[PDB]
Amino acid sequence: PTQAGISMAASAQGAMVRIRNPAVSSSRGGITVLTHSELSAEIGVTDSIVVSSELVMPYTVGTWLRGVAANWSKYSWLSVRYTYIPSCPSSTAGSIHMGFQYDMADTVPVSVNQLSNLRGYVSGQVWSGSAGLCFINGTRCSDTSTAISTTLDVSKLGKKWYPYKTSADYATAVGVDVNIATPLVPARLVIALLDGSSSTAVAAGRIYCTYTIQMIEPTASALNN
């Protein structure tokens, strides 16, 4: 693109990811702030729709964050962002879909449509979204009108302060009744993948999450459940 309205589709997009060292700061008053990025999930697309879901809580979001936040009893999301990066060619067939849900009791979407309604929805070709790189690496952002990434509206969730929960104990409590969950986690991410070309899954891309968290009220790592 030189003029206006003209667009050139590459044979394939490429984004070189480099995650910078974590950012931690113990701000007097109690809170310890952490802002970091981590590869949150691996993606694959098929000709039939597939709905994947991931809880947006510490233990689940980040693999590093898991071990970190463990030393604090509570936490408050300050900014959670799931960005998508395509690791395939434009010759690949397929689209992605993401959005959030807030009451785990609600059934998980089953149509690209139902999902179009969720909060912070996003769709786009499996081979696009490279634009969002500047988010993950943390550089100066250019044109993001083409990027595939959504953010959690921390502005309005159940509480500001949630308890650090462990996948294990969590599930155990959800086993009793799902509902016990709402006071354990803010919301969850919904991810759909359809419009693919083969019955056997194909390498689509990957989703990195870049968050900023507040951690409070310390505890021995192993005393936390």
Query: What residues from 136 to 175 belong to the interface with its own copies (CB under 8 A)?
Result: 136-148, 150, 153, 155-165, 169, 172-173
105 is a contact residue toward its own copies (CB under 8 A): yes
Of 74, 77, 82, 191, the one binding its own copies (CB under 8 A) is: 74
169 is a contact residue toward Ca ion (CB under 5 A): no
C-beta of 36 vs 81, nearer to Ca ion? 36
For residue 140, count other CB atoms closer than 10 A to its CB. 5
- Distance between CA 58 and CA 29 in Å, rounded? 21
27 is a contact residue toward its own copies (CB under 8 A): no
Q: H or E element: which one contains 206?
A: strand 202-218
Site size for its own copies (CB under 8 A): 148
C-beta of 2 vs 25, nearer to its own copies? 2
89 is a contact residue toward its own copies (CB under 8 A): yes
* Beta-strand runs (E) in 12-167: 23-26, 32-45, 50-55, 72-86, 95-101, 119-125, 149-151, 162-163
- Distance between CA 6 and CA 14 in Å, rounded? 21
Asked if 13 and 161 count as a contact pair (C-beta separation under 8 A), the reply is: no
33 is a contact residue toward its own copies (CB under 8 A): yes
Residue numbers of the site for Ca ion (CB under 5 A)? 103, 106, 163-164, 224
